[PDB]
Amino acid sequence: KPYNKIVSHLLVAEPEKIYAMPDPTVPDSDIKALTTLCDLADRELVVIIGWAKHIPGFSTLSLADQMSLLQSAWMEILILGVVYRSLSFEDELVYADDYIMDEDQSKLAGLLDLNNAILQLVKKYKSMKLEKEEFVTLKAIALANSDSMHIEDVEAVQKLQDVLHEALQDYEAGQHMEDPRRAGKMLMTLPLLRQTSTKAVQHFYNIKLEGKVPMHKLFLEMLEAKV
Amino acid sequence: KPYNKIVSHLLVAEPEKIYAMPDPTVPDSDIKALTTLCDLADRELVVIIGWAKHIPGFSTLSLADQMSLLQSAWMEILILGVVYRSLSFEDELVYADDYIMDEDQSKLAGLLDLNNAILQLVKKYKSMKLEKEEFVTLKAIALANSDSMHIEDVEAVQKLQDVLHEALQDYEAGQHMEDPRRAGKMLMTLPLLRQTSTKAVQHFYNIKLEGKVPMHKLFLEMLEAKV
Ligand SMILES: CC(C)(c1ccc(O)cc1)c1ccc(O)cc1
Numbered sequence: 115k116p117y118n119k120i121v122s123h124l125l126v127a128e129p130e131k132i133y134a135m136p137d138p139t140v141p142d143s144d145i146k147a148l149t150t151l152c153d154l155a156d157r158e159l160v161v162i163i164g165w166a167k168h169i170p171g172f173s174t175l176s177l178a179d180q181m182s183l184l185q186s187a188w189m190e191i192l193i194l195g196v197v198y199r200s201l202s203f204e205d206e207l208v209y210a211d212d213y214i215m216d217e218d219q220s221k222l223a224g225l226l227d228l229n230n231a232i233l234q235l236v237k238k239y240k241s242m243k244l245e246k247e248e249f250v251t252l253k254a255i256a257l258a259n260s261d262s263m264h265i266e267d268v269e270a271v272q273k274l275q276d277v278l279h280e281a282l283q284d285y286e287a288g289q290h291m292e293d294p295r296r297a298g299k300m301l302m303t304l305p306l307l308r309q310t311s312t313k314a315v316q317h318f319y320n321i322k323l324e325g326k327v328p329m330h331k332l333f334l335e336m337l338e339a340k341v
Numbered sequence: 342k343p344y345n346k347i348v349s350h351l352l353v354a355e356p357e358k359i360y361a362m363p364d365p366t367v368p369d370s371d372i373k374a375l376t377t378l379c380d381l382a383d384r385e386l387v388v389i390i391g392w393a394k395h396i397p398g399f400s401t402l403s404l405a406d407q408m409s410l411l412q413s414a415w416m417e418i419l420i421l422g423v424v425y426r427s428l429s430f431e432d433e434l435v436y437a438d439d440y441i442m443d444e445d446q447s448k449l450a451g452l453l454d455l456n457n458a459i460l461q462l463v464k465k466y467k468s469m470k471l472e473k474e475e476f477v478t479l480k481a482i483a484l485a486n487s488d489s490m491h492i493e494d495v496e497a498v499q500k501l502q503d504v505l506h507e508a509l510q511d512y513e514a515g516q517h518m519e520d521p522r523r524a525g526k527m528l529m530t531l532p533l534l535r536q537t538s539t540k541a542v543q544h545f546y547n548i549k550l551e552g553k554v555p556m557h558k559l560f561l562e563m564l565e566a567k568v
């Protein structure tokens with residue numbers, strides 16, 4: 115009852131912080147903000163792919179299934195990260211230590227409604243006192259449970275889901291005896307994450323079509339996935 | 342260990358079957374199909390409002406909170422119903438006993454992608470052997486967990502969520518000892534339901550804007566909710 119090994123493992127597999135590095139020579143605009151954010155996402159996607167390899171059983175899936183899970187889950191993983199980084203803040207989203215968006219900035223970027231939904235995720239997790247252990251486990255569950263239409267080995271993916279769910283259940287049983295239903299409460303946060311991700315993918319797909327915001331190869335690869 | 346009372350109660354509160362009654366004098370078209378479906382939804386929404394009153398604690402919320410939960414959850418409740426009605430069928434959606442859509446009909450109605458996602462929900466629940474007891478409990482959880490941005494009494498809504506989650510957990514502990522993680526598996530089906538609902542609301546909102554498909558008052562009320 116030092117806690118669950120999978121949880122411990124995900125904690126040490128957690129990537130280091132990444133800076134956004136908005137270009138200080140460029141005038142502030144919606145284009146600058148969206149460019150900065152998509153550039154940051156592209157770099158994060160590299161680290162997310164590397165991170166996934168540490169999840170027990172993930173690297174044993176076919177390359178096609180690994181890619182399918184990542185192409186369905188990437189936005190949820192990105193959003194859960196900004197959510198977690200923002201828990202100790204008030205009405206602000208910490209995309210990076212050097213890129214914190216308040217309401218005015220979100221409006222300027224055309225992201226008021228989307229960032230408000232992300233702040234809704236933040237609000238609920240603040241009330242629940244979301245722990246880092248729970249965050250990393252939920253990121254892994256979101257990956258495994260992402261509902262790609264293209265899975266080859268359905269049973270192996272369900273097995274991965276079960277392994278990660280078990281880890282969450284075991285963690286909560288040991289760490290949160292005061293609330294025997296806390297694991298389920300955690301799982302019940304996933305629908306809002308999925309809802310927000312679905313809308314964010316459509317939003318940025320539309321930005322891609324408009325062609326005014328430069329996007330890098332990996333971000334585009336994820337955005338152009340069939341979902 | 343005759344099972345959970347809330348589950349038993351939801352089972353007897355289950356509304357009776359409703360027929361679609363497509364107009365046999367009208368030529369088949371996309372407009373006919375969509376008209377028929379939205380008409381059916383309108384009638385179902387009446388029965389769903391009545392049904393919600395049977396859920397322990399729901400009628401004790403403010404009228405505003407009851408409406409907020411229903412306006413966020415209605416599409417999920419409707420979709421979970423067609424999903425459940427379709428479990429014993431193959432690649433067909435049983436909107437009603439007299440309205441069963443196959444792939445060609447979905448294409449004709451402009452609903453291929455949406456109905457395919459609903460069939461994805463069906464596929465997963467068939468594999469899990471979803472029971473009526475679990476269906477009705479999930480409908481109630483979807484209502485309570487619908488993530489409206491407009492809730493007045495956040496704590497009372499979280500209490501309702503907990504009561505219903507407890508019922509699911511208790512049901513599974515008694516009925517499914519072979520799988521100590523089945524309740525969580527059930528909760529993990531909710532993200533796809535939310536994803537599909539989010540897309541369906543947008544789809545039918547766009548049909549509303551186009552103005553070619555007649556819609557009744559209650560369906561419109563739900564569709565025009567701020568979400
Ligand atoms: C994908 C997006 C550019 C992003 C970038 C980086 C990040 O850490 C999280 C999310 C994003 C999505 C939704 C949103 O409202 C703002 C930004």
Ligand SMILES: CC(C)(c1ccc(O)cc1)c1ccc(O)cc1
Nearest residue numbers: 378379382419420423455456541
């Ligand atoms: C809301 C909709 C008209 C409906 C009507 C009735 C129903 O039982 C379930 C869903 C609907 C949603 C999504 C969809 O693909 C088809 C029909």
